[PDB]
Amino acid sequence: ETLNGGITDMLVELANFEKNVSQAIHKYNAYRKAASVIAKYPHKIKSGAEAKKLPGVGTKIAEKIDEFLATGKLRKLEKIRQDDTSSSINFLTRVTGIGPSAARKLVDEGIKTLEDLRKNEDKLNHHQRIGLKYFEDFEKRIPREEMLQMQDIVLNEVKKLDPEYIATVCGSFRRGAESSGDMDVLLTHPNFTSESSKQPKLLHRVVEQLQKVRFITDTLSKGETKFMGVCQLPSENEYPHRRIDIRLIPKDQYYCGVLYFTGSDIFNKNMRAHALEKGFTINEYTIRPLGVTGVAGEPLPVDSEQDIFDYIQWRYREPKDRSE
């Protein structure tokens, strides 16, 4: 239905821009009032020309009206899809090394595109570099065949080390996705408990090792609890590079830890609440009793995922079964 409808709509966004983007209460109000005006209006506006005759509808409008009435868009308007530098923010974000401010800066350097950065290697740091340098694979979703493949390796490898190590790959993959994005590996081992000292070498041993065997190509952040890095499959005739993060957790927290990293923000969200629901407070580290007034704690013993559920009384929603 509604004939003038197109023009009117166009008129709104155009108006909303000038108010929010700038200060001009005058331009907005205007663009604003024209809308008003044309809608009140009942005949299919054939051309802004005519339109001009109309009240509030000034010389300007018409043009913009007619331009729009012409090309199913407006040039002044078109700035929308571009957002200039702001598009770039999110673009840049895609890169691995870049974060909010970090990103903010490159663009304003003139570094909006990958292309810039391709030169400005320096303007970056080792993280930023890497990200770039392999960006592409970075966006090439993984496959379960692969996945399992890399999967096995890790879990296995660790074993070569000391079998009292617990590997677990989490993330989408666990839920049984057919396309995971990264390898979120959680790791642990009885020596390290929440009472334990900072145990770097643990997690470390293994990393270096993955690195040893050449499953690892670069280290994004060797830290003490966490390790971010890259891997890639073994060759013959090659498979891209994939992310991987080796997380190290205390054996007495590793569970919720798992449950959490297991899956779906929703389900977690759902889950977090239900406990709360039944008087339990839950987060990535523990399940604790929710006392009087909302504040209270003293986390219970956990040896397995069921242990959580049970507290918070739930039929086991298997991994697969967790998208909500």
UniProtKB/Swiss-Prot annotation:
Chief place of localization: nucleus
Catalytic residues of the enzyme: K64 (nucleophile)
EC numbers for this chain: 2.7.7.7, 4.2.99.-, 4.2.99.18
Amino acids binding Na(+) 1: K52, L54, V57
Top-rank lineage group of the source organism: Eukaryota
Compartments, record wording: Nucleus; Cytoplasm
GO annotation, cellular component aspect: cytoplasm; microtubule; nucleus; protein-containing complex; spindle microtubule
InterPro entries xref list: DNA-dir_DNA_pol_X, DNA_pol-X_BS, DNA_pol_b-like_N, DNA_pol_B_palm_palm, DNA_pol_lambd_fingers_domain, DNA_pol_lamdba_lyase_dom_sf, DNA_Pol_thumb_sf, DNA_pol_X
Effect of D184 to E/S: Loss of activity
UniProt domain comment: Residues 239-252 form a flexible loop which appears to affect the polymerase fidelity.
Subunit (UniProt): Monomer. Binds single-stranded DNA (ssDNA). Interacts with APEX1, LIG1, LIG3, FEN1, PCNA and XRCC1. Interacts with HUWE1/ARF-BP1, STUB1/CHIP and USP47. Interacts with FAM168A.
Protein name: DNA polymerase beta
Species this chain originates from: Rattus norvegicus
Gene: Polb
